[PDB]
Design a protein around this motif. Structure first.
Motif, PDB file in Angstrom:
ATOM      1  N   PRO A  46       0.698  -1.353   0.154  1.00 53.70           N
ATOM      2  CA  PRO A  46      -0.156   0.010  -0.014  1.00 53.70           C
ATOM      3  C   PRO A  46       0.840   1.338  -0.038  1.00 53.70           C
ATOM      4  N   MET A  47       0.283   2.300  -0.498  1.00 50.43           N
ATOM      5  CA  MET A  47       1.019   3.717  -0.548  1.00 50.43           C
ATOM      6  C   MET A  47      -0.116   4.614  -0.649  1.00 50.43           C
ATOM      7  N   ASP A  48       0.161   6.019   0.121  1.00 49.14           N
ATOM      8  CA  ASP A  48      -0.737   7.012  -0.033  1.00 49.14           C
ATOM      9  C   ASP A  48       0.235   8.306   0.104  1.00 49.14           C
ATOM     10  N   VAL A  71       5.133   7.688  -5.314  1.00 49.60           N
ATOM     11  CA  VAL A  71       3.883   8.274  -5.997  1.00 49.60           C
ATOM     12  C   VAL A  71       3.159   7.372  -7.040  1.00 49.60           C
ATOM     13  N   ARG A  72       4.319   6.917  -7.969  1.00 49.78           N
ATOM     14  CA  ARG A  72       3.610   6.162  -8.997  1.00 49.78           C
ATOM     15  C   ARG A  72       3.221   4.867  -8.480  1.00 49.78           C
ATOM     16  N   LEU A  73       3.714   4.320  -7.434  1.00 52.17           N
ATOM     17  CA  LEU A  73       3.046   3.006  -6.575  1.00 52.17           C
ATOM     18  C   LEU A  73       1.776   3.368  -6.298  1.00 52.17           C
ATOM     19  N   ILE A  74       1.463   4.642  -5.688  1.00 51.90           N
ATOM     20  CA  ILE A  74      -0.038   4.828  -5.470  1.00 51.90           C
ATOM     21  C   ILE A  74      -1.007   4.706  -6.689  1.00 51.90           C
ATOM     22  N   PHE A  75      -0.455   5.061  -7.736  1.00 50.69           N
ATOM     23  CA  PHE A  75      -1.320   5.151  -8.959  1.00 50.69           C
ATOM     24  C   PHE A  75      -1.272   3.819  -9.490  1.00 50.69           C
ATOM     25  N   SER A  76      -0.211   2.890  -9.648  1.00 47.65           N
ATOM     26  CA  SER A  76      -0.401   1.559 -10.060  1.00 47.65           C
ATOM     27  C   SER A  76      -1.204   0.822  -8.997  1.00 47.65           C
ATOM     28  N   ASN A  77      -1.383   0.846  -7.854  1.00 45.14           N
ATOM     29  CA  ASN A  77      -2.145   0.267  -6.977  1.00 45.14           C
ATOM     30  C   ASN A  77      -3.507   0.570  -7.399  1.00 45.14           C
ATOM     31  N   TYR A  90     -10.698   5.185 -10.023  1.00 46.49           N
ATOM     32  CA  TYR A  90      -9.302   4.882 -10.929  1.00 46.49           C
ATOM     33  C   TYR A  90      -9.562   6.167 -11.934  1.00 46.49           C
ATOM     34  N   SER A  91     -10.499   6.769 -12.336  1.00 44.43           N
ATOM     35  CA  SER A  91     -10.484   7.684 -13.043  1.00 44.43           C
ATOM     36  C   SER A  91     -10.048   9.013 -12.484  1.00 44.43           C
ATOM     37  N   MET A  92     -10.189   9.185 -11.148  1.00 44.83           N
ATOM     38  CA  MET A  92      -9.618  10.282 -10.588  1.00 44.83           C
ATOM     39  C   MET A  92      -8.024  10.097 -10.278  1.00 44.83           C
ATOM     40  N   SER A  93      -7.716   8.707 -10.261  1.00 44.05           N
ATOM     41  CA  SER A  93      -6.031   8.475 -10.259  1.00 44.05           C
ATOM     42  C   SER A  93      -5.627   8.829 -11.491  1.00 44.05           C
ATOM     43  N   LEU A  94      -6.251   8.670 -12.624  1.00 46.21           N
ATOM     44  CA  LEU A  94      -5.710   9.077 -13.760  1.00 46.21           C
ATOM     45  C   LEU A  94      -5.234  10.554 -14.117  1.00 46.21           C
ATOM     46  N   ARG A  95      -6.570  11.120 -13.579  1.00 52.19           N
ATOM     47  CA  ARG A  95      -6.133  12.825 -13.953  1.00 52.19           C
ATOM     48  C   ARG A  95      -5.211  13.231 -12.968  1.00 52.19           C
ATOM     49  N   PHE A  99      -1.528  15.113 -13.588  1.00 54.86           N
ATOM     50  CA  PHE A  99      -0.850  16.309 -13.174  1.00 54.86           C
ATOM     51  C   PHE A  99       0.519  16.498 -12.329  1.00 54.86           C
ATOM     52  N   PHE A 100       0.650  15.078 -11.676  1.00 59.89           N
ATOM     53  CA  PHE A 100       1.745  15.064 -11.093  1.00 59.89           C
ATOM     54  C   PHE A 100       3.090  14.822 -11.964  1.00 59.89           C
ATOM     55  N   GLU A 101       2.890  13.960 -13.068  1.00 56.78           N
ATOM     56  CA  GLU A 101       4.018  13.683 -14.007  1.00 56.78           C
ATOM     57  C   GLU A 101       4.277  15.090 -14.664  1.00 56.78           C
ATOM     58  N   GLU A 102       3.308  15.935 -15.283  1.00 52.84           N
ATOM     59  CA  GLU A 102       3.314  17.330 -15.515  1.00 52.84           C
ATOM     60  C   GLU A 102       4.382  18.101 -14.726  1.00 52.84           C
ATOM     61  N   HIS A 103       4.105  18.059 -13.529  1.00 49.48           N
ATOM     62  CA  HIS A 103       4.868  18.949 -12.407  1.00 49.48           C
ATOM     63  C   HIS A 103       6.163  18.512 -11.905  1.00 49.48           C
ATOM     64  N   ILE A 104       6.294  17.045 -11.899  1.00 48.54           N
ATOM     65  CA  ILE A 104       7.464  16.400 -11.440  1.00 48.54           C
ATOM     66  C   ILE A 104       8.729  16.465 -12.507  1.00 48.54           C
ATOM     67  N   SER A 105       8.368  16.532 -13.738  1.00 50.44           N
ATOM     68  CA  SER A 105       9.427  16.321 -14.663  1.00 50.44           C
ATOM     69  C   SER A 105      10.672  17.515 -14.598  1.00 50.44           C
TER      70      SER A 105
END
Ligand SMILES: Cc1ccc(C(=O)N2CCN(C(=O)NCc3cccs3)CC2)o1
Length: 121
Positions: A46-48, A71-77, A90-95, A99-105
């Motif tokens: 688990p991760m949160d 953070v990616r484990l939160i989404f893969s879970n 799940y749809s909330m996870s994808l949005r 947002f996370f990938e846009e900002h972490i790059s």
């Protein structure tokens, strides 16, 4: 931009933005097994976002890459547990993932550049 430590504050601010997002609501605390009795049959780690923040604040990440892994484990879970690709949570996870990938790059790029500049000689 060669500050080797700047990623930490950048990650604190991005986690603040994620905590203001309605889409993060399901991902801010553990799954209740009385609500989801099968959750831990499926999910072995688990991760949160509260655990991610408390790890960062305790000084238990050495790089933004390690934070990015959790953070990616939160989404893969979420993708592993969902019984449909069009479930609400799940749809909330994808949005939130987009947002996370846009900002972490930039955070990752700047850190890796800073470390290269440190080892230039
Ligand atoms: C149905 C479905 C598909 C994908 C998911 C999923 O990724 N889960 C299970 C439900 N989760 C959970 O109960 N979090 C606590 C809170 C929910 C709302 C406010 S606190 C999050 C992780 O669930």
């Amino acid at each position: 931009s060669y500050d080797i430590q700047a990623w930490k504050k950048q990650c604190e601010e991005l986690l603040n933005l994620i905590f203001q997002c309605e889409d993060s609501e399901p991902f801010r605390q553990p799954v209740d097994l009385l609500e989801y009795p099968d959750y831990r049959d499926i999910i072995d780690t688990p991760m949160d976002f509260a655990t991610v923040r408390e790890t960062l604040e305790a000084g238990n990440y050495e790089s933004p890459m390690e934070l990015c892994k959790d953070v990616r484990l939160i989404f893969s879970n979420s993708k592993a547990y969902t019984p449909s690709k069009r479930s609400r949570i799940y749809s909330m996870s994808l949005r939130l993932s987009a947002f996370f990938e846009e900002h972490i790059s930039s955070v990752l790029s700047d850190y890796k550049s800073a470390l290269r500049f440190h080892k230039r000689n």
